[PDB]
Amino acid sequence: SIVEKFRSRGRAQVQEFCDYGTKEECMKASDADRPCRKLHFRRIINKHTDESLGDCSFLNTCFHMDTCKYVHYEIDASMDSEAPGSKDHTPSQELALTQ
């Protein structure tokens, strides 16, 4: 695990790539048991399910949440700049779920 020695000094010149620096090859290794630092985007995926089941379409709005069958592809990474005011966020100051 020498690549860890590079994450230990924190050299800025190392923030220009991961272990090797491949476009499609490292991607396959981004979320697999392949070398690399394993620290690349952690996204959850499921086997190709028949989309006739529900639909979700997370691409924008999930509509009904009760669905969320196996179709879903989301990435987890630090928080971005995040727009100010976040008006694109529905209100929910109440702790209890409205119903």
Q: Which residues bind Zn ion (CB under 5 A)?
A: 18, 26, 36, 56, 62, 68
Q: Which is nearer to Zn ion, 32 or 68 (CB)?
A: 68
18 exposed, middle or buried (CB, 10 Å; 0-12, 13-18, 19+)? buried
- 36 vs 80, beta carbon nearer Zn ion: 36
| Residue 34 Cβ vs Zn ion, minimum distance, rounded to whole Å | 9
Beta carbon nearer to Zn ion, 78 or 85: 78
Residue 60: CB minimum distance to Zn ion, A: 11
Residue 74's closest CA among 52, 38, 98, 41?
41
Identify which of residues 66 and 94 has a Cβ nearer to Zn ion in the complex: 66
- Report the nearest approach of Zn ion to the CB of residue 1 (Å): 14
Q: Which residue is nearest to Zn ion (CB)?
A: 18
Cβ atoms 73, 45 nearer than 8 A:
yes
For 49, 65, 81, 99, the CA distances from 96, given in Å and listed in that order, are 33, 17, 29, 9
Closest approach of Zn ion to the CB of residue 29, in Å: 6
Instruction: Dig out the tokens for 52 from the structure.
Output: 């006739």
